[PDB]
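Subject line: Sequence and fold of a protein, written as structure tokens
Body of memo: The sequence and its backbone structure tokens, given next.
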Amino acid sequence: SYCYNSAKNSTVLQGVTFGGIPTVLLIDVSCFLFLILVFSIIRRRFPWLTAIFRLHDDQILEWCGEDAIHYLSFQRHIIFLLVVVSFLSLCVILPVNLSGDLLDKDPYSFGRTTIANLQTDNDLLWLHTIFAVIYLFLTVGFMRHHTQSIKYKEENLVRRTLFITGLPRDARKETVESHFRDAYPTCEVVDVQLCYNVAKLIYLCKEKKKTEKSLTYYTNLQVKTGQRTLINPKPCGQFCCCEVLGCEWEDAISYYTRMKDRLLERITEEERHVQDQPLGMAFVTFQEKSMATYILKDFNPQPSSHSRELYTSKWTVTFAADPEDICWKNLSIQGLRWWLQWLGINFTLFLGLFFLTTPSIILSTMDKFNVTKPIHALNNPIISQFFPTLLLWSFSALLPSIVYYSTLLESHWTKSGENQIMMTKVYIFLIFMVLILPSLGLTSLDFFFRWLFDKTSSEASIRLECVFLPDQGAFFVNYVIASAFIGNGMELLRLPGLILYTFRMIMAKTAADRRNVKQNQAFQYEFGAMYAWMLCVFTVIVAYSITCPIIAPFGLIYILLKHMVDRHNLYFVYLPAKLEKGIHFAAVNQALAAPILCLFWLYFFSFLRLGMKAPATLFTFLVLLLTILV
């Protein structure tokens, strides 16, 4: 007498053969091995497994980048934490999940190993919650240790210049200087430089420099070949093989000369206009940092004779960044528009997340909507267990470039806030794209299915105690394996990278041009992107640790697959480390979110299964609140 009672001589449809995890795994590893085979061929063109069998931790610091050492230290800390949690979870909590009767002890159903196979009116889930908290301390300790592995000294002394926003457009340098003298007589200013709408000027000068580089290339090509080169200036104009209306061929030197002259005219126009358009922005540099900091905490003000006309109450004052990194070309989009521009991008990118992950989930349950005909209808094990998973992984792989385009479009101010904020906005969107939003989606899908089939269609309401993801949450398990074998081997071969390789070698000017292109063949290692990827998959793993612990070992494999691969990725192909120390600290403050999410989702599923009447729900609420506050 347990959930999934029966149908008329047809059993049930929701059950799956061990969530289909083995077969996809086999398929996955096959592709992985397939990829590694190609890898060998690639390395025979541009086994080396003995290298990873032989790599050591001294030569990497001896010659390669310094920050790669901290990245590998974080990788080692994560692998140790994951192996500890795997051997601590599969030992106790898997037998605890198996010691229940909601799945009727069916032979090869995934749900028998998940939290779904656990009585709601029990005390064993207390262990869950206890388990769900001890992780924190464990993880915290490990993360704390990793901090002591880098212990970067806090030195960011760029504080002699203050960036001030909210100044009136009619403000003058003399007036603001007099205001600072009056409000802060003990504080003396060396220089005030008002910011104007130069942005448009920057943009034009960037296009001039691009045009000149192009002109110099075609002039040097003529001089070398004696031939005039015709070009098509339309998008994709290289692929225009035929004189069709819209594929006009022009002389390259004549085109780029005319473009340069038109850009020069517009630059000279804009240079006259530059003052007329101030931003009400200001930079105030100082002899000493301490007076600037004094003004800063004072604002975080002292009246002057020039307080009223300068609208001092509307100013926002911060420490000015490095003058060589501040994006002037993105400073003209200040004001509420920027804030609106904010919502003008992420939200639509948010609406992107509903159009790439929701498909996959649908293919996961495209055969589980009739909630009847329960006679082994299911689907081919290739699809609905693997194909949606691979599709989700591929969309996640395409996401970081989309986030790069979005961050460029939203036009931030400081270049420093273009990689740390980049990593944060890739990690958050990845979490919202694989872990939280898809899980909520298919949990609500199971709610719909249960309302369609379980005791509601016949005479009553929903028996909500046995509510869980369809395939009993097998899907993310596949994802982890899809991120471990096919995903990691795929990342090893860098198919976007090799596509760029082939697309740059095929499209050229001369057949024998192997000298060029190869100069930019290798690219800088994007520590932010790979940190965000590892943290996204780690959140997917640890989030379902107290729940559906079969993922816990599989995710371990992932990080191992990652570890070795990134070692190779940090020795042979990709460039050495260059990034700053802030990214690693942010990544340290990133893994702490995974067990918090795990606690939140354990509480969420417990509250979904059983109401708030039981003291367990109240205990989960209070403990989640206190750990979140701390």
